[PDB]
From Swiss-Prot:
Main localization of the protein described in the UniProt heading: secreted
Keyword Secreted part of the UniProt annotation: yes
Physiological role: Cytokine secreted primarily by mast cells, T-cells, eosinophils, and basophils that plays a role in regulating antibody production, hematopoiesis and inflammation, and the development of effector T-cell responses. Induces the expression of class II MHC molecules on resting B-cells. Enhances both secretion and cell surface expression of IgE and IgG1. Also regulates the expression of the low affinity Fc receptor for IgE (CD23) on both lymphocytes and monocytes. Positively regulates IL31RA expression in macrophages.
Gene Ontology CC terms, in alphabetical order: extracellular region; extracellular space
Residues of the full protein shown: 25 to 153 of 153
Subunit structure as annotated in this protein's UniProt entry: Interacts with IL4R. Interacts with IL13RA1.
Keywords, alphabetical: B-cell activation, Cytokine, Disulfide bond, Glycoprotein, Growth factor, Secreted, Signal
Name by which UniProt lists this protein: Interleukin-4
Higher taxonomy: Eukaryota, Metazoa, Chordata, Craniata, Vertebrata
Family: Belongs to the IL-4/IL-13 family.
Gene Ontology MF terms in the entry: cytokine activity; growth factor activity; interleukin-4 receptor binding
Top-rank lineage group of the source organism: Eukaryota
Pathology noted in the entry: Ischemic stroke: A stroke is an acute neurologic event leading to death of neural tissue of the brain and resulting in loss of motor, sensory and/or cognitive function. Ischemic strokes, resulting from vascular occlusion, is considered to be a highly complex disease consisting of a group of heterogeneous disorders with multiple genetic and environmental risk factors.
Gene: IL4
Keyword hit for tRNA-binding: no
Amino acid sequence: HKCDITLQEIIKTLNSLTEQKTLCTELTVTDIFAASKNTTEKETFCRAATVLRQFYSHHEKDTRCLGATAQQFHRHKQLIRFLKRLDRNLWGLAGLNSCPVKEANQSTLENFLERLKTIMREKYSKCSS
């Protein structure tokens, strides 16, 4: 149908993490892509959003990539802060806000951004008719 400003923004945020992905990549997140997820992109985004939440928000600490060097710490906050934008603003790009799940496969946050990125890439391209 068309593209909204919202997704162009999203793709910018995803982008600017992909280019600064290294120390706190890899980390294990819910694999919301490996169970007959051939449902709507919007659902994938709903269900994907929740995991980004538990990511940026649960972590905000847990030492888990904090990197020790007060310096590396600044990056931690940086990603987590943007990931917050993405969380709060994935809801807008998704539409829905009721999509629990129960994926008990696991994947990486490296792959989470890839597999997230792809679906916006997909949905942003085929924006038109």
